[PDB]
User: Fold Ryanodine receptor 1 from Mus musculus.
Amino acid sequence: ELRDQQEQVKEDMETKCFICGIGSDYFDTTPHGFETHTLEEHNLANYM
Amino acid sequence: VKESKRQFIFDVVNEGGESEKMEMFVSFCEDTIFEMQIAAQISEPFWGELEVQRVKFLNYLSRNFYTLRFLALFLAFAINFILLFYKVSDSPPNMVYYFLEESTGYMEPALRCLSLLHTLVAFLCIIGYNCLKVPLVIFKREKELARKLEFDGLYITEQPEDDDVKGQWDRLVLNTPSFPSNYWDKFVKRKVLDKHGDIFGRERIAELLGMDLASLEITAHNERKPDPPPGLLTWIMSIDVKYQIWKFGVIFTDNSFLYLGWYMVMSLLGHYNNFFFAAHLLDIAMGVKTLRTILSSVTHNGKQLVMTVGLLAVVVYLYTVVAFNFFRKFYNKSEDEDEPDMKCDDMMTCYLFHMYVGVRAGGGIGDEIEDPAGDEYELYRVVFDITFFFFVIVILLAIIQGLIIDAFGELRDQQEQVKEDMETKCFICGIGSDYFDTTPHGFETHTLEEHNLANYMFFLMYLINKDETEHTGQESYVWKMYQERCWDFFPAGDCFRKQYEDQLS
Amino acid sequence: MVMSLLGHYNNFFFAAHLLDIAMGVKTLRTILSSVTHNGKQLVMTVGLLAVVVYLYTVVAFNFFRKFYNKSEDEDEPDMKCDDMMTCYLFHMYVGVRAGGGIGDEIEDPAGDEYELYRVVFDITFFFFVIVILLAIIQGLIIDAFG
Amino acid sequence: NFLELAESILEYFRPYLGRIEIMGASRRIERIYFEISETNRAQWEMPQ
Ligand SMILES: CCCCCCCC/C=C/CCCCCCCC(=O)OC[C@H](COP(=O)(O)OCC[N+](C)(C)C)OC(=O)CCCCCCC/C=C/CCCCCCCC
Ligand SMILES: CCCCCCCC/C=C/CCCCCCCC(=O)OC[C@H](COP(=O)(O)OCC[N+](C)(C)C)OC(=O)CCCCCCC/C=C/CCCCCCCC
Ligand SMILES: CCCCCCCC/C=C\CCCCCCCC(=O)O[C@H](COC(=O)CCCCCCC/C=C/CCCCCCCC)COP(=O)(O)OCC[N+](C)(C)C
Ligand SMILES: CCCCCCCC/C=C\CCCCCCCC(=O)O[C@H](COC(=O)CCCCCCC/C=C/CCCCCCCC)COP(=O)(O)OCC[N+](C)(C)C
Ligand SMILES: Nc1ncnc2c1ncn2[C@@H]1O[C@H](COP(=O)(O)OP(=O)(O)OP(=O)(O)O)[C@@H](O)[C@H]1O
Ligand SMILES: Nc1ncnc2c1ncn2[C@@H]1O[C@H](COP(=O)(O)OP(=O)(O)OP(=O)(O)O)[C@@H](O)[C@H]1O
Ligand SMILES: Cn1c(=O)c2c(ncn2C)n(C)c1=O
Ligand SMILES: [Ca+2]
Ligand SMILES: [Zn+2]
Ligand SMILES: [Zn+2]
Assistant:
């Protein structure tokens, strides 16, 4: 169960945006779309 | 090459990220192109004759490296089967004599012959590894160093962290004349000079990289055609000591080479004492894939297992402290009344007794120590025993077994995840199979024809071999991006079918 | 049918037919499929156990022979480890089956120059063979179930 | 052309140029550009 919890956290962060919640599948339509979105557009560090 | 491709796919899917996926793919393509070169070289077709024979022998060893490795295992097993017949006697066949006890009498000469053959085969295995697998190690090391120099300025703009031994060791090879020996880019030194020659200084860059600026100009000025004789003295003069030292450091810091060296050392020790050949039976773990996976189950959580053993030691130490302070009288282990053997009259002896006997006991320390019935500390000591049994014998051993089982499950999950990722998503563009399957067998056709990673690797090989002046527009475009190390040409989240969906329909 | 025919030669050969429950009952078939799912891994694990026990036997034969006397009578000593084959059989047969390993059977090392070496021998035997390897087998069965 | 000429300025101010997206009063997603101080960035990058 603990391993599953850690894996779930990793998968949730890798596949879904923390702020808007849109999946990485939509963003990846553009090359590196999810990476750009989570590093520039919707960075929680930027919000803080 | 298929095994390498499977391993690379497993690595990228399990551990790699999406951002660096194409870069790792291109690195895999470069490594494979070198492996095909090595395989082509080793493929089967007085100093001159000696050199020809040496090349043929080394090629044979490289070709039959794995066969030699299996022969080593077979010889070790035969040697140990013979060893099973050793006997020890006081009389020769006060010192004890070890000797074979067999009716036939052929075993002892057979034992000597098998030991000599095993040592020879171990030496041949080391040579075969050096000739077959080491070249890829040196190629990858040189490629990484060249990329770090050119694009990261590792020794120009930055410096090694001083905790990374690889970077510190790589300083040796920078100024050596033969820096890119296995790596294809023989002009990396000049590329680095041109890129960083202005900010960091051309003369200082030349000093760092062992370059001669006048020679740079003269070589382009006119050709040079030396014809040195193939003599031993000329070869010795040609040796580059610093580069050889760096290469030997890289090799000796290689796990597989270290394993083979240990194998040969143990084989040599086997002639000193035949029983040292028993260590070679451990080679089954490396040889058999099934045993390798079974042992990977254990080693997956090795750190956790070691920490659990340490926690067990600490808990047993606390139990020892309590027993030493309060329950000494129960630790007499001598039936004789005259001579008492008190295990817990000193802390070190009590701790050894606990760790050695109580942990191994089925019911804990209470199985060994004296019965507490009819004692003023009976309840305290029965609680002591029950807590020992539950915390040490039950819970902690259960923790170890659960770690092993979870390692099994995690490895199976990793394999299943790799299989599912390859079956449901395209490796190159990353579009799911659901979109492609709209057309009959759409995903299969897309992954076999449209976006075949094998086809991409074949393209790089085709672009390298084809003359530049013959490159088409698209070929020249992809070539420039390969040379500039930009992977934008790889389709990501897009495809021909999606681009022309309306027209194609 | 061959076993049924043999049963007329000796009635006790009919006991072999009780194994037919595995084929007959679906539940037992699944329970046994749990074991047979990782049968190759189980057999390889048994082989690895044999090899590890062989290494322990080699070490005991070379260094710890004196502790392998299994005869109470002083006049007649029954030395299990005076030859490699007998030592290997003793190990594989008794130490593996022992709850605490080979040290449960072999003589106490207290007050010996090799006491620390032999207690390390016993502890390593217990942890690698009794604990880890049997744990590997049980984990294989559980993973097959899952 | 202006962006290419200003690459140096943009590269210099990249760490200090923070961008976020919000749901504005107009009910459309709007991008806000602000300044991230060096002290704030360092404090955020502290390991704790
Ligand atoms: C994760 C870790 C797992 C477990 C860790 C290891 C715990 C091991 C123990 C379990 C229970 C053992 C029962 C405790 C025995 C107490 C005996 C007692 O009470 O005898 C009354 C004494 C009389 O004094 P005296 O004249 O005989 O000698 C005193 C001077 N001398 C000591 C040098 C000569 O009075 C006294 O000492 C007053 C009390 C002295 C201090 C008592 C502290 C002992 C530690 C107890 C552990 C607490 C946890 C227990 C719960 C189980 C674990 C969950
Ligand atoms: C995955 C595999 C799991 C485990 C595999 C099985 C390992 C079994 C062992 C565990 C520890 C046993 C402790 C070693 C005992 C050494 C005894 C010693 O040191 O006595 C000093 C001797 C004195 O010589 P002598 O006059 O008495 O007779 C010498 C001539 N003869 C031998 C025929 C008469 O000096 C010498 O022999 C010098 C040393 C001789 C060579 C020592 C090599 C012994 C092997 C040790 C295994 C290393 C791993 C240990 C770590 C635990 C596993 C993780
Ligand atoms: C993954 C877990 C790894 C642990 C696996 C351990 C496996 C151990 C099992 C079997 C191999 C050792 C069994 C003892 C053989 C008899 C020894 C003997 O007899 O010592 C005696 C003492 O010579 C020596 O020590 C030589 C020096 C050896 C140095 C020790 C080297 C390292 C020890 C290694 C154990 C195997 C490697 C394990 C990996 C650890 C290193 C990374 C040799 O015999 P002698 O004096 O009667 O001379 C007979 C011939 N004349 C008549 C010439 C006088
Ligand atoms: C999945 C794991 C598979 C393993 C399962 C094993 C189950 C074994 C348990 C029970 C069945 C055997 C128990 C012994 C019965 C008494 C034997 C006896 O008594 O032998 C005595 C010797 O005749 C024989 O041997 C006959 C030749 C038999 C050849 C062996 C055939 C194969 C052996 C099989 C065991 C079962 C099959 C297992 C599968 C292996 C084959 C693929 C018979 O008796 P008698 O000489 O006093 O003559 C009494 C009658 N008059 C008075 C005429 C003189
Ligand atoms: N809104 C979001 N903001 C930031 N990261 C997001 C967001 N949504 C998803 N992510 C993902 O979270 C991960 C953040 O990366 P990561 O946590 O490793 O950053 P880091 O700066 O290395 O921090 P740390 O070293 O503490 O892990 C990325 O995989 C990113 O895609
Ligand atoms: N871009 C891609 N290129 C190739 N195969 C892809 C790609 N994306 C997904 N796949 C999938 O990867 C699998 C490749 O098949 P597979 O690896 O079995 O090939 P093979 O030639 O039999 O090689 P091997 O015998 O080494 O496994 C297929 O299931 C295929 O659909
Ligand atoms: C990427 N790449 C290679 O991978 C390569 C090469 N020459 C040989 N190889 C292997 N060239 C010129 C190249 O650009
Ligand atoms: Ca042209
Ligand atoms: Zn978002
Ligand atoms: Zn695709």
Observations:
- Chains A and C do not touch (no CB pair under 8 Å).
- Residues 2-15 of chain A form the longest helix (14 residues).
